[PDB]
């Protein structure tokens, strides 16, 4: 199952909390964002976080 | 056109080269044929009886044509198969170095292979010649 | 068909059939239709193949099993009983001989006859072991199309295997024999008998 751990969802929460201008419904730019904007020790963790901030972005846009 | 043996399917070539080495009458077949068994990993001697030494001579020929050099041991390991150790599991075993070595000498004496440097046996220019020839012959039958 | 050659040449009927129709070993994939509603979508036929051998990933999802070419499903289910696990070259060649043999008897696309036997042997309804309190009765159930195809293949091959075991006829003669009698149900075939029985019992407990 692909249930994202708390650290992913918690980091995604704080990112969209304080960097909503910037970010988009695009993973690939949110990813590059998370590089220049957060400090993640691993590529995989960073892609998970970014891909999830992207999901929350894509579904904040409709409510 | 032009031709190699690499242009002929393995079996109709070797069958052909066998019947030719047969026809020939020049060959040298040590003597212990028909009484011998090709491999200690085997049960019955070959069923060709008056022959098969041609078939392996042809087989050995085409093999030595195909590459740089090959010794008696590579042909032993090549022509070695699966020995049923009865009630124990099978195993790969090598075939007879007498049969192969006497083939390499009866084909070198007939100038179709030659003690090579580095090691082993190399295909002879005159062998290239005659192999490519009967290869052409074997394709000619399919016309 | 407009022959063409280059350096290393390519044979006559080889070129001819290939670039023209995209047919089997050398049998017709057009025509041949499943003579039964349902079973369509679960018997392949088109896209056509040359020989029944595919590195197919038909397993890593539920129903994708159904998109496998049907002949290859037949061939696949040949190669079993421990000794013949793997050994698909063995199975493939047996199928080729088998289609050739069926074609000898009564004409017909032998691949069509195969389709005919597969259709005619899937049991329309079966039974299952209900509890119902210790002494278990048998609930009649209407079995799926997919289970009907699968059980058809396994039935024809198995009864062909029992029939080829310990006698002079080869696997391809008896496979063909079963596919022949089962193409038009004759109850001289292991498959038709077993299909008729599973339906007889399923009816008798409803």
């Amino acid at each position: 199952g692909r249930v994202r751990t708390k650290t992913v969802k918690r980091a995604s929460k704080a990112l969209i909390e304080r960097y909503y201008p910037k970010l988009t419904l695009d993973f690939q730019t949110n990813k590059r964002l998370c590089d220049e904007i957060a400090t993640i020790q691993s590529k995989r963790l960073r892609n998970k976080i970014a891909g999830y901030t992207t999901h929350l972005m894509k579904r904040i846009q409709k409510g | 056109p032009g031709v190699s043996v690499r242009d002929v399917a393995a079996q109709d070539f070797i069958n052909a080269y066998a019947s030719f080495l047969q026809r020939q009458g020049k060959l040298e077949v040590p003597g212990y044929v028909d009484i011998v068994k090709t491999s200690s990993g085997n049960e019955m001697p070959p069923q060709d009886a008056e022959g098969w030494f041609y078939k392996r001579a042809a087989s050995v020929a085409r093999h030595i044509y195909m590459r740089k050099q090959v010794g008696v041991g590579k042909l032993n390991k090549l022509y070695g198969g699966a020995k049923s150790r009865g009630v124990r599991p099978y195993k790969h075993i090598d075939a007879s170095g007498s049969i192969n070595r006497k083939v390499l000498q009866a084909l070198e004496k007939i100038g179709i292979v030659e003690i090579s440097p580095k090691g082993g046996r190399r295909i002879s220019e005159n062998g290239q010649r005659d192999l490519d020839r009967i290869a052409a012959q074997t394709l000619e039958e399919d016309e | 068909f407009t022959p063409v050659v280059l350096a290393t040449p390519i044979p006559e009927e080889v070129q001819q059939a290939q670039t023209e129709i995209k047919l089997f070993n050398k049998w017709s994939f057009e025509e041949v239709e499943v003579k039964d509603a349902s079973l369509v979508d679960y018997v392949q036929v088109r896209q056509p193949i040359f020989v029944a051998h595919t590195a197919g990933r038909y397993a890593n999802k539920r129903f994708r099993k159904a998109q496998c070419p049907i002949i290859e499903r037949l061939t696949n289910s040949l190669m079993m009983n421990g000794r013949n696990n793997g050994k698909k070259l063995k199975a493939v060649r047996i199928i080729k001989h088998t289609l050739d043999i069926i074609n000898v008897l009564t004409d017909q696309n032998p691949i069509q006859v195969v389709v005919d036997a597969i259709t005619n042997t899937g049991p329309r309804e079966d039974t299952t072991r209900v509890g119902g309190g210790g002494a278990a009765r048998r609930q009649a159930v209407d079995v799926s199309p997919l289970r009907r195809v699968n059980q058809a293949i396994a039935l024809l091959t198995i009864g062909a295997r029992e029939a080829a075991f310990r006698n002079i006829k080869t696997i391809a003669e008896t496979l063909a024999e079963e596919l022949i009698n089962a193409a038009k149900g004759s109850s001289t075939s292991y498959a038709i008998k077993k299909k008729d029985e599973l339906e007889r019992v399923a009816k008798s407990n409803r």
């Binding site: - | - | 979508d41 129903f63 329309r124 509890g131 209407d142 799926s144 199309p145 339906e199 399923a202």
Partner: protein, 63 residues
């Protein structure tokens, strides 16, 4: 002999104690506008065609 052909329209769930039977609502194709619920033996999805052998008789639970 009378063959009845019914198209699966909905998947209702597994029955039987062992859990291999599936309950299914079917709409027979020769004259629609009438539903029946049957029990399958093999794997089933939406829009398959079951050969109901006796046209009027449905079941529900299985032990």
């Amino acid at each position: 002999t009378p063959v009845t052909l019914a198209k699966v329209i909905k998947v209702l769930g597994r029955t039987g104690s062992r859990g291999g039977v599936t309950q299914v609502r079917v709409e027979f194709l020769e004259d629609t506008s009438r539903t029946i619920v049957r029990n399958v033996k093999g794997p089933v999805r939406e829009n398959d065609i079951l050969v109901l052998m006796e046209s009027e008789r449905e079941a529900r639970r299985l032990r």
